[PDB]
Amino acid sequence: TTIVGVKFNNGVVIAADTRSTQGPIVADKNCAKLHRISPKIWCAGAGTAADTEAVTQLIGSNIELHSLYTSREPRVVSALQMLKQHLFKYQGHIGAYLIVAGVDPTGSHLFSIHAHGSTDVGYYLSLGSGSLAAMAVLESHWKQDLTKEEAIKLASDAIQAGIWNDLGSGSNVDVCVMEIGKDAEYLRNYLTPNVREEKQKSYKFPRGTTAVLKESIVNICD
Amino acid sequence: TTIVGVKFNNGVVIAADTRSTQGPIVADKNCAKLHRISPKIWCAGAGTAADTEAVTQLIGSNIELHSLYTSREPRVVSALQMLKQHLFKYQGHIGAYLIVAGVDPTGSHLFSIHAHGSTDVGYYLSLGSGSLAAMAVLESHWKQDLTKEEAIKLASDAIQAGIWNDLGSGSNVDVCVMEIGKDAEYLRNYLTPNVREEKQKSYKFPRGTTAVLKESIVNICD
Amino acid sequence: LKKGEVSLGTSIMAVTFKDGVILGADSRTTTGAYIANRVTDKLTRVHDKIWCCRSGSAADTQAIADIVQYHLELYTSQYGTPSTETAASVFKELCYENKDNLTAGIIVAGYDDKNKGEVYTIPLGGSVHKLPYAINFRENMSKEETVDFIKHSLSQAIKWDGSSGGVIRMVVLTAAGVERLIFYPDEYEQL
Amino acid sequence: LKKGEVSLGTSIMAVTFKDGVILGADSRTTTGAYIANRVTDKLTRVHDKIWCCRSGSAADTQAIADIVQYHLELYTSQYGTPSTETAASVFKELCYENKDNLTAGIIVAGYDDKNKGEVYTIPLGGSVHKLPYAINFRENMSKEETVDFIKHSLSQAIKWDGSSGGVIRMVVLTAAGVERLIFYPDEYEQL
Amino acid sequence: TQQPIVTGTSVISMKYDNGVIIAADNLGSYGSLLRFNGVERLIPVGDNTVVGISGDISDMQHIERLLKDLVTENAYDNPLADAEEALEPSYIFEYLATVMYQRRSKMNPLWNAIIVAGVQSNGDQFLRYVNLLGVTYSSPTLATGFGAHMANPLLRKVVDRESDIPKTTVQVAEEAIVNAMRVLYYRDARSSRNFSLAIIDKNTGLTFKKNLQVENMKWDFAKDIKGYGTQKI
Amino acid sequence: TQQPIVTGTSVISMKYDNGVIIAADNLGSYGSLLRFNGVERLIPVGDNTVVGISGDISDMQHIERLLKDLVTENAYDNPLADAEEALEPSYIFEYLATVMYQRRSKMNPLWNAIIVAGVQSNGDQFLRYVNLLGVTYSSPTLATGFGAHMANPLLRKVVDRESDIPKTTVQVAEEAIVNAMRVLYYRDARSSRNFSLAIIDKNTGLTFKKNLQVENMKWDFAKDIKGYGTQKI
Amino acid sequence: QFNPYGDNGGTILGIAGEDFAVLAGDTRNITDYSINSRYEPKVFDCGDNIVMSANGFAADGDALVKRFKNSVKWYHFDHNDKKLSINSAARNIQHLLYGKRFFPYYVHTIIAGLDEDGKGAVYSFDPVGSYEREQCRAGGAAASLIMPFLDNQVNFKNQYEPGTNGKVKKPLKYLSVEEVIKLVRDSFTSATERHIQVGDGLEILIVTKDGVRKEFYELKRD
Amino acid sequence: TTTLAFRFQGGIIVAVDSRATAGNWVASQTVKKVIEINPFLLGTMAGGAADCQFWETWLGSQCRLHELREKERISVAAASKILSNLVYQYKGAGLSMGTMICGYTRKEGPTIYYVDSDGTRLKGDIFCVGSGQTFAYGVLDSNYKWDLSVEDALYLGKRSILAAAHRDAYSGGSVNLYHVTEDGWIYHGNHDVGELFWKVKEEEGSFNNVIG
Amino acid sequence: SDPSSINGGIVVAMTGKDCVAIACDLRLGSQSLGVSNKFEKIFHYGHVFLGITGLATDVTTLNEMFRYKTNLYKLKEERAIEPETFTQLVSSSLYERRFGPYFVGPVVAGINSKSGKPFIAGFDLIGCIDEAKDFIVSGTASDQLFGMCESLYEPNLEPEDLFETISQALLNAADRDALSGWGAVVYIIKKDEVVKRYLKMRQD
Numbered sequence A, B: 001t002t003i004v005g006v007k008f009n010n011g012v013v014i015a016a017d018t019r020s021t022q023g024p025i026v027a028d029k030n031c032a033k034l035h036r037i038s039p040k041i042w043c044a045g046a047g048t049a050a051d052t053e054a055v056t057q058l059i060g061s062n063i064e065l066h067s068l069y070t071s072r073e074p075r076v077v078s079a080l081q082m083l084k085q086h087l088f089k090y091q092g093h094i095g096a097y098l099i100v101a102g103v104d105p106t107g108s109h110l111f112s113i114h115a116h117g118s119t120d121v122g123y124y125l126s127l128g129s130g131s132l133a134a135m136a137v138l139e140s141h142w143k144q145d146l147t148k149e150e151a152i153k154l155a156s157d158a159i160q161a162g163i164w165n166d167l168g169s170g171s172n173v174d175v176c177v178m179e180i181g182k183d184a185e186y187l188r189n190y191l192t193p194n195v196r197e198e199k200q201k202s203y204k205f206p207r208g209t210t211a212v213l214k215e216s217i218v219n220i221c222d
Numbered sequence C, D: 001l002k003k004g005e006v007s008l009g010t011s012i013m014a015v016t017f018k019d020g021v022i023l024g025a026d027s028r029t030t031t032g033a034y035i036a037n038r039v040t041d042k043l044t045r046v047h048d049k050i051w052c053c054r055s056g057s058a059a060d061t062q063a064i065a066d067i068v069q070y071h072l073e074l075y076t077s078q079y080g081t082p083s084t085e086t087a088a089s090v091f092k093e094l095c096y097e098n099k100d101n102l103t104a105g106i107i108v109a110g111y112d113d114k115n116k117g118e119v120y121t122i123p124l125g126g127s128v129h130k131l132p133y134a135i136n137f138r139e140n141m142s143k144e145e146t147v148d149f150i151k152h153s154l155s156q157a158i159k160w161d162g163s164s165g166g167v168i169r170m171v172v173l174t175a176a177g178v179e180r181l182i183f184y185p186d187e188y189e190q191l
Numbered sequence E, F: 001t002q003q004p005i006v007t008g009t010s011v012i013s014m015k016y017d018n019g020v021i022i023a024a025d026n027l028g029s030y031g032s033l034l035r036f037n038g039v040e041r042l043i044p045v046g047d048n049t050v051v052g053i054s055g056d057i058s059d060m061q062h063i064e065r066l067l068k069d070l071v072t073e074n075a076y077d078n079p080l081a082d083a084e085e086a087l088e089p090s091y092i093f094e095y096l097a098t099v100m101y102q103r104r105s106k107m108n109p110l111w112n113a114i115i116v117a118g119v120q121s122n123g124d125q126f127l128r129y130v131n132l133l134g135v136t137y138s139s140p141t142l143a144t145g146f147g148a149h150m151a152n153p154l155l156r157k158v159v160d161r162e163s164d165i166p167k168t169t170v171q172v173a174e175e176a177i178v179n180a181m182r183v184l185y186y187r188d189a190r191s192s193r194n195f196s197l198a199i200i201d202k203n204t205g206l207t208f209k210k211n212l213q214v215e216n217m218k219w220d221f222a223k224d225i226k227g228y229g230t231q232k233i
Numbered sequence G: 001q002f003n004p005y006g007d008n009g010g011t012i013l014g015i016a017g018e019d020f021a022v023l024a025g026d027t028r029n030i031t032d033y034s035i036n037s038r039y040e041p042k043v044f045d046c047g048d049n050i051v052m053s054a055n056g057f058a059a060d061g062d063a064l065v066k067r068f069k070n071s072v073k074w075y076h077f078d079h080n081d082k083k084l085s086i087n088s089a090a091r092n093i094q095h096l097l098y099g100k101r102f103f104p105y106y107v108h109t110i111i112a113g114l115d116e117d118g119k120g121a122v123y124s125f126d127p128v129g130s131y132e133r134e135q136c137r138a139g140g141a142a143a144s145l146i147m148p149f150l151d152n153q154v155n156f157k158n159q160y161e162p163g164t165n166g167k168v169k170k171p172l173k174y175l176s177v178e179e180v181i182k183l184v185r186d187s188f189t190s191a192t193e194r195h196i197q198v199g200d201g202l203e204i205l206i207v208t209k210d211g212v213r214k215e216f217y218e219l220k221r222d
Numbered sequence H: 001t002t003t004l005a006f007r008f009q010g011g012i013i014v015a016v017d018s019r020a021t022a023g024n025w026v027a028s029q030t031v032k033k034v035i036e037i038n039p040f041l042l043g044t045m046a047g048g049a050a051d052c053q054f055w056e057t058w059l060g061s062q063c064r065l066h067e068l069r070e071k072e073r074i075s076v077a078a079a080s081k082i083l084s085n086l087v088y089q090y091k092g093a094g095l096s097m098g099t100m101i102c103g104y105t106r107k108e109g110p111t112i113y114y115v116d117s118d119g120t121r122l123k124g125d126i127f128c129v130g131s132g133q134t135f136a137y138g139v140l141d142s143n144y145k146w147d148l149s150v151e152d153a154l155y156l157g158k159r160s161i162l163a164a165a166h167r168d169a170y171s172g173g174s175v176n177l178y179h180v181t182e183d184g185w186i187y188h189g190n191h192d193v194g195e196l197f198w199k200v201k202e203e204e205g206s207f208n209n210v211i212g
Numbered sequence I: 001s002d003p004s005s006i007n008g009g010i011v012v013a014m015t016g017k018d019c020v021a022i023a024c025d026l027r028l029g030s031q032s033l034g035v036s037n038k039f040e041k042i043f044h045y046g047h048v049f050l051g052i053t054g055l056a057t058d059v060t061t062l063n064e065m066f067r068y069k070t071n072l073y074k075l076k077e078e079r080a081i082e083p084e085t086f087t088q089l090v091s092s093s094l095y096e097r098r099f100g101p102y103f104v105g106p107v108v109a110g111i112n113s114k115s116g117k118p119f120i121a122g123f124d125l126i127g128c129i130d131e132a133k134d135f136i137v138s139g140t141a142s143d144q145l146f147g148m149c150e151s152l153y154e155p156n157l158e159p160e161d162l163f164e165t166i167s168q169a170l171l172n173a174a175d176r177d178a179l180s181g182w183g184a185v186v187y188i189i190k191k192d193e194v195v196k197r198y199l200k201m202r203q204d
């Protein structure tokens, strides 16, 4: 996995790759690693896939209920705190490595959370097996006072670095842009630089190729 | 075991206890831990009893042959060097912890050797399980410019500290005094402060107590 | 210390001086030989004028510091502003009772108006030690001297320890208020 | 390091200065927490004006130093007085080829008339490093300054490390000859 | 189950004709590092008892609080808290010894070795040891850690048995203790020069001496020592 | 069987149109300690090859002597030792790669990762890697340790494949290398600011640059960072 | 890892007569090779003419004795000051010991007193509560040295009547309190010679219908 | 340790040795390895001494409570099952027990149950447990008949323990005999193995390998 | 899997007045199983007696070895070996295998044919000599023997008295050891006559 987060002028952007491994096997070639916690708070997750989804949905549920109770839009620090306290409680056994970002009435925020419950603040962050490839790019090209378009470029470039150079990362680039005063825009498959080439042959079988012993109609109705 | 060595005016003195353990069992109540390497070079040994005797006899043998070859009286540094090089070669597997002392044409010397092959120089030394009890005494009462009689007292006091306070040490005190220009005097059982008290009863059996099945004469002659 | 978890090294210090107390630290955070964060803030606020320096496990020290901040906020609501000694006690109580599961080395530093600048160190075991300073110091140094003392000291730690590096952050606690200071590599390296 | 064997600690140094070079060390030798020898001489002569500082295993460092002394005595008989660099090479050759079975950290220091004072350090791996000094120093210090530098440095090591203690021994290597110095606890502690 | 971090070394003590003496250095070590030099490991409870503690320092500070809280609790609804129903060394000991054994039986010990030294209401001397295992014993001389190996042998030359106690004065006892502390400084790698000493006398009461130093040491003979065997220079 | 003691970190390299570049910092680390700061880990062999070595420093110094002894031995009974029968990078590599595999096959490896960078007699660029296991590979960009994770991704943006080599100049290549070294200083805990860099060009020959420093770093943004989440001050 | 057990050494001995019973034990307390105390009693008067010793790990021995003493106290409260018979105490101690079957008291327990017919009784326990009444029993470190001697002298094992061709055994008979104390003293002086953990002093508690009497004897201090 | 118990025409014979060892050290030669649960029931000790003593004494208490409540002698089946169900609760904790619960009732006749600390409960005619069980089985198997007389049966049990006591290092001391009838058990004395061996050797002509 | 306690057995030696005695049990087993009741552990080479406890294969092997060495000693020296000399031979031979030792506990006993002095000695498995005036013990019941010998023994016993003392030391020690017993033999050794008696003991 390769996930990043980049702060810019009037907001924050996060990105991720779309490969899901199972050892050396690619289970999913186009999986969604960007999670919605609240409408304007999104989370990119690396590590144990079932854990990143389960923890982001649980906190997202509790955030929605909190938002209704308080009659206020949720804050990123609320998500951040609820997540780290949950992760810390399980002492790293919930293998969720997250990058949390969003906009709230306080402003635009970007954080990272490790499985053990440690949080970090930054203008640019990267997590996952391709975090070193991505951070190399970020440390080379990042600057203060980025624009929305500059930040999306930097982010997707950082993810690409992981796709190409890291075997645990691959396929496509997902992005989500959270700008202040605007609706958050989720860019699913923002880049698709790994399209499978045409096959040399069609392996469509002549009908009757397969040997059959029995046939029967299944009753799905009542 | 408790062994010590003390330097004085015109010579050196070493002492030792006489207990030989086998776990918590006392195998020998009056064993000799003072070894003769050459006539005027004596060695006190602690650790593995078979190793201290075997190593001191081997070096003593080679020292005797060397003395005959060179037409000279042996030196302590020669014994010291031959011992440490042998012990070092076996990497501590020969559990011999020694205090080497003697007089030669160069003067009076006192050294210690550890099983691993390290040597130390000193005016007062102690080795064995009772070395801490003994060194406590030596550090309390030792001074520069001791006399022969003061040194024997200090030495036997240091050994006593081990006899009483250390369970691995016991029984009697052996001493050997090596003075310059004199024959070395080996004082076997210099002190005997652990004499067994009279038994309350004689357990001498009435003759015929023991039941017997057969009797026969053994032929030891040709 | 758990395997692969984020470590905070150990280059932190707090020094008392004439006008109050100064906390100082580096900014490096590691996961093995990889620097996870090079601009970390190890100087954390538990109360208006009571701060701490964190070392060891980042997760553990954050969780504790958060709890302490909770206790001192609740203390203040009921019993008024707490003492630096009280803050150190709460830290200790947590670090001591949970010593089996934690790896946290904390230095607590604060400013009272009666007690002035105080420094308490809380090592791994969960013991507390009140000191004049913690990590040719003299008592009652000036602000400028104490800054140079912390600067020069941490500068050397960074020079020889790979677990340490980045910027040198410092927080000054006085009756005047709270002042944050920062010193970049080009400045401190060539000292 | 083999279990129970005699350890030499690690508080040793050699510093080059105007007139030559000075070796310095403590006198403590341990077996666990027990001080086996408190007046050890860790400064050993391998040649007239080539000495070494021993650290790690006492047995290992003694065996090596003895062998080196043998090689330099034989070298001198055939090829004349050897260089300090040559001495360091023989040490390294032994420490490197037998790195699996040894625990020896050695600092070699010597005085030539051409090369003047030289210092070579040989750590655990069996690598060699030529340096101006080894363990705020200035090149070409005076004898009195270099003594105070070693004295103050080892004094602190003894203060904070339990593997170090006793007296501070020093050997001065110059064209004048060889001078042995010693400094007792009452002097260096209250520095 | 624990492992000790910052530790305190030997605590030595002995009985004399009118009371007891106890001493311990002012050091808190950290493996091999001599980190904390202002550590008081002797804790007076009232004006008739002194508890000397070695081992883990954080567990020692816990025990300090227990004893302090014990004194407070004893004064509750007790008009004779400074007289007949005041705390005795034997009460304080049995409390700690109960705690130490309970903690080891829960497999969560207080990693300490404790010596309670004091004088009872009837003038009798009290000197008893308890450690992390809850093991207790009493003797004319008691010591922990290294003190057991190096100090006890020296102190037992003065008081080798019960009958030697009336013959031993405070001046002699204090001299043996101070000598023992010097020997431990020579030979214990985990010790310091600075130490504290306390005397509980049935006539003069509790005398507590801080900021003592080991002195009259022998180091001069070191200059004559050269090399490790053959070396002459 | 060994275990490395004093080590050297990343060695990074890349090909450009007329030659190769190689670089490595001047540090010898001891676990976590930055002990030796004057360590040269780039070793020129002749005027056409540079061997960059990471890993155990004592094993590196052994390899230095082998290469030095190789040059001497090649000059023996060789009138063309400074011309046709001079040492080539491909000769020097195959020698080391033979040694490294022999040592691992004897279960006594040289704990190193090596990159031989050079230019052949016919002008071709040479860049090949070998490590303690005897594993060899070649690529337009090569790096050891961290460099493999952080530098390669940056250098491959410049030369992503063989066809990009003629398009890459020395000025661009050197800039990528120097940038990569800064990134490693930011993110490798076992790295230093000081480093060495070498260029082997088929026209201008071997240029060896010592005492370089990482510069133009970004640290200013650190002042705006406060706490780890909620903290505002 | 924390080892909750230890070995405090020492050895105990219980012999039963016709109208009396003795329970003896050395007064030395040790850990490893050090001496903790030269006089630390471990044979106790528990009331109702019962004497008790729990030898092995002193902390467990002290706790067990303390609990049994308390068991005697509550037996009186609950049962109208009834006297606790030696057989009833034995069964009670079994339940105390077995109550910790899965975290035992590391002690060999012996009690002595008089049975309900006024005859001497000795009961020995294993660490978890198996018990048996006996005429003779040694326990602790030097039990292996002492016990075969008792078999020979108390129960007259292996001794046949002189002249009877080993057909007629030597007849069993009760010994006097004076003869028993001789065997105890000689048992302990012999054990002191060959066992390092045994020495310093010997305390014997004799039990008759008149009450409990004590006797102390010195032993070698090495 | 060697313990055997077998059913026959005249009831049950129970025979055990007396030795207890802690390693090579012989702690006791006078150990009671038959537990008198009550006047009608016996139990053998093998494995853990305390485990067998404690829980078979406890069993006697449960058997007494049964007959108080039900006004009828408890069956051997029911008595054995109370013990086996109890130790099964403790399975895994480390109890060590190998015992024969022996009794003679009207509805059952002479009955023996092997009960064991891993929960096993077997009814049978002949059982042998202990380090010397194999030696005892040999003598039993070759000489056992249902129509044995009480005199001959007692000797067979005695002789079988002797066979074990001789060969098995951890068996010896003395032999304890019991005969269990419908009206209760009868003790048939303690027999020192030392004296018994020589006696049997002479009278029987066995053990020719041994010089006497 | 402790070689010194697989087969089991014991040996004890005592001095008297112008006499020595040496005795052994007769058991050989394989842990709990008793295998032989005739396994004698005492051998003699001329007038020097050697008892060996421990691992039975090494007992047999060492006897064959010292028979070998003493037979050659006699051919070359033209005289039989003495106890003091033989003791050093045993120590030499054992330490020769210092890092691959024979698992034995030998005991030497005999009288010097020249001086008439009684001599006994014991060794550990690597040849540490334990010379003694009083008695020597070896085997699986060495602790037991130490307790019996230390209490029963008294100096200058006559042959007929020493017999009873050593016999009772052995028998009662062996009865508290599971791996010792099954028979016993006692050698009473005088300057120019030697009596060998088989004891009657319990066979369990």
Ligand SMILES: [Cl-]
Residues within 6 Å of the ligand: A118, A119, C029, C040, C041, C042, C058, F228
């Ligand atoms: Cl942090």
Ligand SMILES: [Cl-]
Residues within 6 Å of the ligand: B118, B119, D008, D029, D040, D041, D042, D058, E228
């Ligand atoms: Cl040394």
Ligand SMILES: [Mg+2]
Residues within 6 Å of the ligand: A162, A163, A164, A165, A166, A167, A168, A169, A170
């Ligand atoms: Mg990929």
Ligand SMILES: [Mg+2]
Residues within 6 Å of the ligand: D158, D159, D160, D161, D162, D163, D164, D165, D166
């Ligand atoms: Mg020190």
Ligand SMILES: [Mg+2]
Residues within 6 Å of the ligand: G191, G192, G193, G194, G195, G196, G197, G198, G199, G220, G222
């Ligand atoms: Mg003794």
Ligand SMILES: [Mg+2]
Residues within 6 Å of the ligand: H164, H165, H166, H167, H168, H169, H170, H171, H172, I203, I204
């Ligand atoms: Mg048997």
Ligand SMILES: [Mg+2]
Residues within 6 Å of the ligand: I174, I175, I176, I177, I178, I179, I180, I181, I182, I204
């Ligand atoms: Mg037997």
